[PDB]
Design an enzyme around this catalytic site. Structure first.
Site, short mmCIF file in Angstrom:
data_model
loop_
_atom_site.label_atom_id
_atom_site.label_comp_id
_atom_site.label_asym_id
_atom_site.label_seq_id
_atom_site.Cartn_x
_atom_site.Cartn_y
_atom_site.Cartn_z
CG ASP A 290 -2.02 1.03 1.10
OD1 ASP A 290 -2.78 1.00 0.09
OD2 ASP A 290 -2.01 1.92 2.01
CD1 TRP A 291 -1.49 5.06 1.36
CD2 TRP A 291 0.02 6.08 0.07
NE1 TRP A 291 -2.17 5.85 0.47
CE2 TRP A 291 -1.26 6.50 -0.33
CE3 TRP A 291 1.14 6.62 -0.56
CZ2 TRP A 291 -1.45 7.37 -1.37
CZ3 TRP A 291 0.95 7.46 -1.62
CH2 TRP A 291 -0.33 7.86 -2.00
#
Ligand SMILES: [Cl-]
Ligand SMILES: [Cl-]
Length: 296
Positions: free
Chosen positions: A105-106
Site C-alpha cells: 500500500d503506501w
C-alpha cells in the site's frame, strides 16, 4: 494454524526530524536487513506474523510511519512528501546501506520511491497490494469506488474518516477476507483513539494516484513504475483473489512484464493480505532471501 494476535516485539525508538519513530528491530546485525513498510491505516502490527519467518536468518526492521502506530504525532498535513522525509531520515538514522524491501500500500509507494532513488541499495523487493496509477476511476475496483470517491473530499471524507473512524472501523476489516478479532481491532484502533490524530488516515486516500489527481503523486508513481519495469532486481509479488489494488489478472500481467519476478498466489485475499495468509507470505519471503545475497 490460528493467526496470532499478539505483538511480541520489544519497542525501539529513534528521533528524526524532531519526532520519535517506533520500530521493530530483531534478528542478526551482520547481514543485509529486511525493511518492512506498512500502509494505511496499519502499523508494524500488520507484519507481526510474517516477521517470525524471516528473523531467524535476517534482521527485520519494521517502522511505524510518522503519525501512526507507536510513533509520535506531529501536527502535519501528512502528505506523501512528509512520509518520504521521515522515512528517508529513519533509514539513514539506522545506518542502513543495502536492504531488502517488504512493502504494502503506501509502504510500497514509499519503498518503490526509495528504491528508484537508491537502486544500488536494494537487493530485492517483496511486494503485495501495491500502489500503481489508476488512470481513470474505471480502473479502480468497482466495489471500492464510491467509498474512495467519498473519502477524497474535504467535507464528507473528513466526516467519514476523522469523525467516524471509517478507515479503521470500516475499510480495514472490509478488506480482510477472514473476520478480524476484537483484540486485533483494538491493536489497530489504539493509535487513533483521539479523532484529531486521524489526519494521516484521511490524507492518504487523498494522495492516491487516481484519475490524474493529485498530479505530483501520479508523476512520482509513474516514475517508480517505469523504474520497476526496467529493473533487474529480484521481485516477489504476492496476490490474492479477488484482490483490491492488484486483481489476479493484473498480477499475471506483472509476472510477465516485471523482470525477475515470481508471483505467489495466497488464496483468498482483498487488500490486507498479511491478515489472511501471513504464514505463506513469511515462509516464501524467508525461502527467497538467500539467493539475493551474492553480488553479481
Ligand atoms: Cl500467525
Ligand atoms: Cl489510502
Amino acid at each position: 494454524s490460528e493467526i496470532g494476535t499478539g505483538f511480541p516485539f520489544d519497542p525501539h525508538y529513534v528521533e528524526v526530524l524532531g519526532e520519535r519513530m517506533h520500530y521493530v528491530d530483531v534478528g542478526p546485525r551482520d547481514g543485509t536487513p529486511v525493511l518492512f513498510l506498512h500502509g494505511n491505516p496499519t502499523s508494524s502490527y500488520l507484519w507481526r506474523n510474517i516477521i517470525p519467518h524471516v528473523a531467524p536468518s535476517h534482521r527485520c526492521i519494521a517502522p511505524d510511519l510518522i503519525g501512526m502506530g507507536k510513533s509520535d504525532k506531529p501536527d502535519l498535513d501528512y502528505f506523501f512528501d512528509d512520509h518520504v522525509r521521515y522515512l528517508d531520515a529513519f533509514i539513514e538514522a539506522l545506518g542502513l546501506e543495502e536492504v531488502v524491501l517488504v512493502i504494502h500500500d503506501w509502504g510500497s509507494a514509499l519503498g518503490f520511491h526509495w528504491a528508484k532513488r537508491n537502486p544500488e541499495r536494494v537487493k530485492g523487493i517483496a511486494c503485495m497490494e501495491f500502489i500503481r496509477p489508476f488512470p481513470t476511476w474505471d480502473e479502480w475496483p468497482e466495489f471500492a469506488r464510491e467509498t474512495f470517491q467519498a473519502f477524497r473530499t474535504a467535507d464528507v471524507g473528513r466526516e467519514l474518516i476523522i469523525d467516524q473512524n471509517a478507515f479503521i472501523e470500516g475499510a480495514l476489516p472490509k478488506y480482510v477476507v477472514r473476520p478480524l478479532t476484537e483484540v486485533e481491532m483494538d491493536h489497530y484502533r489504539e493509535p487513533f483513539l483521539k479523532p484529531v490524530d486521524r489526519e494521516p488516515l484521511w490524507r492518504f486516500p487523498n494522495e492516491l494516484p487516481i484519475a490524474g489527481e493529485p498530479a505530483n503523486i501520479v508523476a512520482l508513481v509513474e516514475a517508480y513504475m517505469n523504474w520497476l519495469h526496467q529493473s533487474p532486481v529480484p521481485k516477489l509479488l504476492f496476490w490474492g483473489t479477488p484482490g483490491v489494488l492488484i486483481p489476479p489478472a493484473e498480477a499475471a500481467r506483472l509476472a510477465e512484464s516485471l523482470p525477475n519476478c515470481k508471483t505467489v498466489d495466497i488464496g483468498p485475499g482483498l487488500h490486507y493480505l498479511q491478515e489472511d495468509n501471513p504464514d505463506l507470505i513469511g515462509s516464501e519471503i524467508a525461502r527467497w532471501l538467500p539467493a539475493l545475497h551474492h553480488h553479481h
